[PDB]
mmCIF file of C-alpha atoms and ligand atoms in Angstrom:
data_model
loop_
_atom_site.group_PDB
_atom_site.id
_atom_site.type_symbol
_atom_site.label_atom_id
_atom_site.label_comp_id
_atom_site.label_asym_id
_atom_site.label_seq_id
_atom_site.Cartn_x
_atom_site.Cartn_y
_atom_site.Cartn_z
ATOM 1 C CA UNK Z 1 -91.870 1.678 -30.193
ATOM 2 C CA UNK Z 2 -93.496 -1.900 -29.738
ATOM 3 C CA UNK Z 3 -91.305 -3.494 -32.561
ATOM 4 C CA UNK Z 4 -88.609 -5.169 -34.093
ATOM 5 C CA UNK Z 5 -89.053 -3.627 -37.528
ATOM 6 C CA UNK Z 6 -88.359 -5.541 -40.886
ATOM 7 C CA UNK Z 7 -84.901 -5.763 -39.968
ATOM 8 C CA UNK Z 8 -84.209 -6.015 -43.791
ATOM 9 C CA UNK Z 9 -81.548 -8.411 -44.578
ATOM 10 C CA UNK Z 10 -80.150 -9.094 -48.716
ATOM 11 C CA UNK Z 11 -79.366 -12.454 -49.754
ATOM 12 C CA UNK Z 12 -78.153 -12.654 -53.175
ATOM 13 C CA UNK Z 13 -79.716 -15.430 -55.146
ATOM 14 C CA UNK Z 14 -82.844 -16.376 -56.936
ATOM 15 C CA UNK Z 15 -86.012 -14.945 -54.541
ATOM 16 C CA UNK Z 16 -87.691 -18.829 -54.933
ATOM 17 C CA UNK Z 17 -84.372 -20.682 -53.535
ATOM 18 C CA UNK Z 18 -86.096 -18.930 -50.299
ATOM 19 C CA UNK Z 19 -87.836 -21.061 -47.736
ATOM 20 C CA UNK Z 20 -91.425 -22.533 -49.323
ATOM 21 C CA UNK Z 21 -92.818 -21.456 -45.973
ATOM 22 C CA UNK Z 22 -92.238 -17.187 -46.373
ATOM 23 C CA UNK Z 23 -94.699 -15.503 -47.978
ATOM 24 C CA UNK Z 24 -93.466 -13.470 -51.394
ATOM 25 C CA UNK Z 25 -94.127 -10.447 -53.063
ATOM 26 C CA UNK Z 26 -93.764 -8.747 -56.397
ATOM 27 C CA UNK Z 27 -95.455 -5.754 -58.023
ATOM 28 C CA UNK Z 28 -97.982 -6.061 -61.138
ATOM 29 C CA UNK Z 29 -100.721 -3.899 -62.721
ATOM 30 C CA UNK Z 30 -104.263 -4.138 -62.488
ATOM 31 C CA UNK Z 31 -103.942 -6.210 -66.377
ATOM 32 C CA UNK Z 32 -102.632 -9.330 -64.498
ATOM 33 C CA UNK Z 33 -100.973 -9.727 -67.920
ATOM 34 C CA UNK Z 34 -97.532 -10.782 -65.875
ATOM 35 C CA UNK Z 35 -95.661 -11.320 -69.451
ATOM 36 C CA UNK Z 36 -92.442 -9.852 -68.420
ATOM 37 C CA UNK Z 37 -89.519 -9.773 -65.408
ATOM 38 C CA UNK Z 38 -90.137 -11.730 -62.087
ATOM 39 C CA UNK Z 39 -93.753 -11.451 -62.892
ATOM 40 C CA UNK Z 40 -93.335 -14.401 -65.387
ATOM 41 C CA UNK Z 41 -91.786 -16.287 -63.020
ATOM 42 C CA UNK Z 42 -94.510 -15.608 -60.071
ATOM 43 C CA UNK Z 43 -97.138 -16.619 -63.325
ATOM 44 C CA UNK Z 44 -95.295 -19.996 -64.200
ATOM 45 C CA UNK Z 45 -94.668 -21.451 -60.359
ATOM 46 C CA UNK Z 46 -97.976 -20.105 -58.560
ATOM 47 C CA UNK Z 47 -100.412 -19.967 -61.399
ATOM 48 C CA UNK Z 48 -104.053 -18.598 -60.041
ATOM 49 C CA UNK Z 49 -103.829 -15.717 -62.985
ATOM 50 C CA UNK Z 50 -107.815 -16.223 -63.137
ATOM 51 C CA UNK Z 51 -108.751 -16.454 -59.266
ATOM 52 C CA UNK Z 52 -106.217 -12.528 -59.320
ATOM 53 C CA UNK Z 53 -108.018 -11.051 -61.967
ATOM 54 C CA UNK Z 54 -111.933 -12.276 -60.020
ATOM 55 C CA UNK Z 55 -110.371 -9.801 -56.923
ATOM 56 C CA UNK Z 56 -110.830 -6.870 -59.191
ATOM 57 C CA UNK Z 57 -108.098 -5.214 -57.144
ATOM 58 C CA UNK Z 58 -107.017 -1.802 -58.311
ATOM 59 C CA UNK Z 59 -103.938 0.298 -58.236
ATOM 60 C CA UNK Z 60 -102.410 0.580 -54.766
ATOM 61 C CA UNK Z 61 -104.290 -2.220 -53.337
ATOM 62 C CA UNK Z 62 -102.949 -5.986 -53.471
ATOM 63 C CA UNK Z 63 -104.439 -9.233 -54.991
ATOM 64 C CA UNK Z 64 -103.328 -12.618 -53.216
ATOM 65 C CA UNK Z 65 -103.201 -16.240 -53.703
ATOM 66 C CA UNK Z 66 -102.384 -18.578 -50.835
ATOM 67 C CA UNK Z 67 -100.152 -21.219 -51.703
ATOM 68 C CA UNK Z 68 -98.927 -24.658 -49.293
ATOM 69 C CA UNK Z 69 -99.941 -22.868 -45.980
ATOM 70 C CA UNK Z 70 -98.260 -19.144 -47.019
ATOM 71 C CA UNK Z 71 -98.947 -16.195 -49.413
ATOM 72 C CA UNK Z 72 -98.365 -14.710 -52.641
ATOM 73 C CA UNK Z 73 -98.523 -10.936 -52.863
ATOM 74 C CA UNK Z 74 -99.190 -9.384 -56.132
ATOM 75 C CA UNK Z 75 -98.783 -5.701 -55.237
ATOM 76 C CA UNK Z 76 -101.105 -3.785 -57.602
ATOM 77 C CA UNK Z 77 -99.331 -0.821 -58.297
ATOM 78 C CA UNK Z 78 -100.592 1.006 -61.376
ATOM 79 C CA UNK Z 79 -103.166 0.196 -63.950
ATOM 80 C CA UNK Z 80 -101.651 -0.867 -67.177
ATOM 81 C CA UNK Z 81 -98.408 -3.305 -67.683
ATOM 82 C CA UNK Z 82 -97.064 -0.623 -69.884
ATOM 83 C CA UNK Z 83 -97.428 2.162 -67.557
ATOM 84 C CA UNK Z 84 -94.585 3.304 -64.671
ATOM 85 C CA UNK Z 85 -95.871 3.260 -60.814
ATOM 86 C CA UNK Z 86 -95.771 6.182 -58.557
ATOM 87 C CA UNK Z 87 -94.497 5.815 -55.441
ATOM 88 C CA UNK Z 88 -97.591 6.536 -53.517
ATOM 89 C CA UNK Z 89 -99.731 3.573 -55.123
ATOM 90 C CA UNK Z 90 -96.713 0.995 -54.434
ATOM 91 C CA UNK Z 91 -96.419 2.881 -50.879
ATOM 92 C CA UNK Z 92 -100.469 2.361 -50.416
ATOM 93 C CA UNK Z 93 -100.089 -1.284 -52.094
ATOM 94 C CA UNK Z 94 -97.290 -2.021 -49.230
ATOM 95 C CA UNK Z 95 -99.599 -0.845 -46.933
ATOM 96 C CA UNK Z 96 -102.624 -3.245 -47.822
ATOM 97 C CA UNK Z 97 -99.834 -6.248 -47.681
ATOM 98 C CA UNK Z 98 -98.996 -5.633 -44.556
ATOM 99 C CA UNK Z 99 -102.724 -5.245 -43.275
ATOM 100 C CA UNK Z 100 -103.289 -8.660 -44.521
ATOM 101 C CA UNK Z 101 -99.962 -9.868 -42.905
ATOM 102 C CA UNK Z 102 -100.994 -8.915 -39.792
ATOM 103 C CA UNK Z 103 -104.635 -10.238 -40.429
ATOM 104 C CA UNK Z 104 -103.452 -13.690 -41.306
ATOM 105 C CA UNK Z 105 -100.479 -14.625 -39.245
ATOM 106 C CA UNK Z 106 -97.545 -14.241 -41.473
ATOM 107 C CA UNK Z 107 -93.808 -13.823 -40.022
ATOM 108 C CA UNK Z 108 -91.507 -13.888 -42.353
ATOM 109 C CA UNK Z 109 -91.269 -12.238 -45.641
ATOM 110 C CA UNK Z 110 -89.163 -12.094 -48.807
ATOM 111 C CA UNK Z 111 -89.229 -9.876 -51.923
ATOM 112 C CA UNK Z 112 -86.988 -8.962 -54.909
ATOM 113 C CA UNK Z 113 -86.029 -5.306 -55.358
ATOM 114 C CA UNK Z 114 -89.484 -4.453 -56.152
ATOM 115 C CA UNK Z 115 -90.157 -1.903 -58.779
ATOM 116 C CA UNK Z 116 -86.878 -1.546 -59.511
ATOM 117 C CA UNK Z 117 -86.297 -3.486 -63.045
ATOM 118 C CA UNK Z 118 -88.775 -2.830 -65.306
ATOM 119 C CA UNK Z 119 -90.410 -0.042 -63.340
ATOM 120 C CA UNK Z 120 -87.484 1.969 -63.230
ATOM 121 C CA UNK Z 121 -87.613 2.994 -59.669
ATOM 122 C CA UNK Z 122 -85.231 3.630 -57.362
ATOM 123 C CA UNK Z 123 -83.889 1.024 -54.788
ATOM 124 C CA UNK Z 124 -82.493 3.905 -52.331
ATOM 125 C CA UNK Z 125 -86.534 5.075 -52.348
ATOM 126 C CA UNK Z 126 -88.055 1.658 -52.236
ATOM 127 C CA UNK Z 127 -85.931 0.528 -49.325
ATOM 128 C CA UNK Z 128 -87.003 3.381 -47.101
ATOM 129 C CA UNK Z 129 -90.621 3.269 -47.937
ATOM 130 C CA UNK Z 130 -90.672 -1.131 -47.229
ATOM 131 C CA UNK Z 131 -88.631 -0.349 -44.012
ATOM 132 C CA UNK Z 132 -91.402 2.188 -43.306
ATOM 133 C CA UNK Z 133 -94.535 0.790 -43.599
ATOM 134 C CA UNK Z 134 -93.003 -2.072 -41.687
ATOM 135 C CA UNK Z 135 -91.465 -0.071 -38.804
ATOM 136 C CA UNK Z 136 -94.525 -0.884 -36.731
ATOM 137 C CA UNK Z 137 -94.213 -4.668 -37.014
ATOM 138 C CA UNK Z 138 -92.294 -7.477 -36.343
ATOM 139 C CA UNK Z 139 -92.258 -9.305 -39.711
ATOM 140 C CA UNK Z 140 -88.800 -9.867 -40.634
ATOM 141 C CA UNK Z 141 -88.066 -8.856 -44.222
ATOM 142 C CA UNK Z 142 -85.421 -10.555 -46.797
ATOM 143 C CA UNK Z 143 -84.559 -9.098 -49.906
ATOM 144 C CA UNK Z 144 -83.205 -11.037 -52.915
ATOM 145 C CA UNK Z 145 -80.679 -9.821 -54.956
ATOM 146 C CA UNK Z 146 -79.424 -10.304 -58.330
HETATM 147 CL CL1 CL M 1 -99.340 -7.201 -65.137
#
């Protein structure tokens, strides 16, 4: 291989004490509706709710907002806020997020335990498939945890 890999490392604490300069990412549905869990949080800080929903992005795709020089991923990974994800639209929504890290320069990375509040997933699944999709890269990873 070419790469470094995510190299995923956990820091427990609140995912925005991280540096303002990584870019973040959470999971949503297609609603932008963001009315409950970290998604509330991502709504309050970064704001943009109307310039997600004019990307029309759909499930396993991801919507974006860039914010003081880095991004905001909002992983599209099922249609409705009150339905469950399958793992192939977050794994295809991963996917896209990389493409555009590698599109648009971005190093360094941090994320909650995505999908795995609210959406009920499995963190033993979700690790595997992030440290996956980003085998092939060198965008170091850092996972918040509560
Ligand atoms: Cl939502």
């Amino acid at each position: 291989g070419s790469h470094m890999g995510s190299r995923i490392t956990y820091v427990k604490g609140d995912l925005f004490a991280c540096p303002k300069t990584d870019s973040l990412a959470h999971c949503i549905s297609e609603d932008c509706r963001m009315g409950a869990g970290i998604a509330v949080l991502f709504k309050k800080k970064f704001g943009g709710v109307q310039e997600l929903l004019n990307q029309q992005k759909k499930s396993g795709e991801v919507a974006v907002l860039k914010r003081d020089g880095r991004y905001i991923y909002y992983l599209i990974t099922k249609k409705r806020a009150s339905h469950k994800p399958t793992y192939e639209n977050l794994q295809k929504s991963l996917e896209a997020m990389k493409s555009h890290c590698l599109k648009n320069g971005v190093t360094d990375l941090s994320m909650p335990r995505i999908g795995c509040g609210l959406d009920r997933l499995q963190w033993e699944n979700v690790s595997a498939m992030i440290e996956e999709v980003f085998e092939a890269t060198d965008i170091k990873i850092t996972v918040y945890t509560l």
